[PDB]
Amino acid sequence: RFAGVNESGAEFGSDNIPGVYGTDYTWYNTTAMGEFISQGMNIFRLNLLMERLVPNTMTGPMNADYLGNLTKDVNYVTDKGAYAMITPHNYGRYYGNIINSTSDFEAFWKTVAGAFKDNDLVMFDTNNQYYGMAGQLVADLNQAAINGIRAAGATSQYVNVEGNSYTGAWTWTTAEGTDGLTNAQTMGNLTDPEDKILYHMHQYLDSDGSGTSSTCVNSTIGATRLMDATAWLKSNNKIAILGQYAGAVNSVCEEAVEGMLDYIDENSDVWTGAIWWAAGPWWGDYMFSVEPDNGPAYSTYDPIILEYS
Numbered sequence: 001r002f003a004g005v006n007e008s009g010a011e012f013g014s015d016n017i018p019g020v021y022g023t024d025y026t027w028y029n030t031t032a033m034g035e036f037i038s039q040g041m042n043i044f045r046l047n048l049l050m051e052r053l054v055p056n057t058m059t060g061p062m063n064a065d066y067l068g069n070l071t072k073d074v075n076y077v078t079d080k081g082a083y084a085m086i087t088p089h090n091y092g093r094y095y096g097n098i099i100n101s102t103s104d105f106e107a108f109w110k111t112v113a114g115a116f117k118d119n120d121l122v123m124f125d126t127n128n129q130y131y132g133m134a135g136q137l138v139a140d141l142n143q144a145a146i147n148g149i150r151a152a153g154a155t156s157q158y159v160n161v162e163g164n165s166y167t168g169a170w171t172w173t174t175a176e177g178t179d180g181l182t183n184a185q186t187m188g189n190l191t192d193p194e195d196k197i198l199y200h201m202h203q204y205l206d207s208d209g210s211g212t213s214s215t216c217v218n219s220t221i222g223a224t225r226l227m228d229a230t231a232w233l234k235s236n237n238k239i240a241i242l243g244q245y246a247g248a249v250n251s252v253c254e255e256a257v258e259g260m261l262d263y264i265d266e267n268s269d270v271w272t273g274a275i276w277w278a279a280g281p282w283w284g285d286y287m288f289s290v291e292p293d294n295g296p297a298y299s300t301y302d303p304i305i306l307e308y309s
């Protein structure tokens with residue numbers, strides 16, 4: 001169903017706010033995403049920095065310039081009939097502080113969603129990879145985001161909710177927040193007036209699930225790492241999307257990736273698709289880059305992504 005790529009770059013140099021366009025961060029290569037769309041890819045997760053989109057205070061107005069760049073890339077993707085997911089890539093933090101005010105987060109999402117409220121090909125993603133946080137707070141922030149999105153009149157779009165502990169699928173039931181609570185203990189009770197919640201988890205295939213190593217543990221490690229989360233989703237009648245995953249260019253990773261995507265296809269009653277990490281124009285020889293012109297992983301995994309589209 002959903003099959004596509006992350007676009008990463010507009011959130012780079014996150015320590016430099018607002019940062020310098022062309023030095024700290026950049027926006028995306030529409031010629032490259034046009035190739036992906038022409039191939040049949042139908043979703044692009046557009047990563048961005050909260051402090052650049054809504055500077056100084058998360059309840060404030062949106063920066064016209066950075067919003068203007070976001071909107072051009074969103075409209076490029078959606079004018080060509082693909083989904084654009086808007087992802088504040090902030091780990092649950094704003095100017096480095098854990099986001100502790102559900103009211104402020106509701107307001108931030110009301111503001112952002114208001115700019116895209118009539119575009120049904122837009123998807124909202126409450127925040128990338130909350131971590132190191134009270135589990136209850138992460139659930140409460142996801143709920144606040146849903147509230148603000150629908151309060152803006154953005155009623156057609158899926159809302160991607162992300163768990164604590166880097167929203168890892170393999171640790172959904174085991175990783176503990178600051179309050180001792182797991183994602184399984186906190187994220188089930190989310191409600192949406194439009195019933196369009198996607199449980200958005202990430203899954204890497206290396207030893208510690210971080211994706212920093214090119215070595216995938218073994219040929220089945222992806223599917224096996226989704227099994228516990230898939231039971232939680234099936235049992236609690238939720239649906240999900242694999243919003244980041246990757247393997248490097250070697251035979252074990254390629255088999256593990258194939259096997260993961262087959263597992264999601266076999267469990268399509270709960271898994272709606274998968275989004276590769278990552279494309280974007282500033283990755284160079286990054287082992288996971290599928291950017292067409294120079295991504296080391298493009299020629300191996302671009303066909304695999306399309307095979308599950």
Ligand SMILES: OC[C@H]1O[C@@H](O[C@H]2[C@H](O)[C@H](O)[C@H](O[C@H]3[C@H](O)[C@H](O)[C@H](O[C@H]4[C@H](O)[C@H](O)[C@H](O)O[C@@H]4CO)O[C@@H]3CO)O[C@@H]2CO)[C@@H](O)[C@@H](O)[C@@H]1O
Pocket residue numbers: 129165166168171202204208209210211212
């Ligand atoms: O995944 C993308 C995202 O990953 C980030 O790195 C994470 C990584 O995802 C993963 O969550 C990893 O989790 C470890 C964790 O570090 C603990 O060490 C944990 O261990 C525990 C051990 O299993 C025992 O239970 C013991 O009793 O307690 C130990 C911890 O106290 O095991 C978890 C997985 O099993 O943590 C890293 C970050 O440290 C980032 O790389 C991020 O940038 C990336 O986007």
Ligand SMILES: *[C@@H]1O[C@H](CO)[C@@H](O)[C@H](O)[C@H]1NC(C)=O
Pocket residue numbers: 029031032035281292293
């Ligand atoms: C943008 O994508 C095109 C098409 O793949 C590529 O030829 C070009 O080099 C890319 N530009 C940048 C800055 O990466």
Ligand SMILES: *[C@@H]1O[C@H](CO)[C@@H](O)[C@H](O)[C@H]1NC(C)=O
Pocket residue numbers: 021064065066067068069072
């Ligand atoms: C993108 O941002 C720059 C400032 O960094 C601004 O000059 C430009 O007009 C923006 N683009 C759009 C389409 O608004």
Ligand SMILES: *[C@@H]1O[C@H](CO)[C@@H](O)[C@H](O)[C@H]1NC(C)=O
Pocket residue numbers: 140143189190191
């Ligand atoms: C979810 O549970 C928490 C506390 O357990 C709280 O935010 C609220 O009571 C619940 N949310 C909804 C929408 O019921």
Ligand SMILES: *[C@@H]1O[C@H](CO)[C@@H](O)[C@H](O)[C@H]1NC(C)=O
Pocket residue numbers: 217218219220221
């Ligand atoms: C793959 O690795 C996981 C985690 O280390 C392990 O539990 C599992 O037994 C391994 N599978 C095979 C077939 O070796």
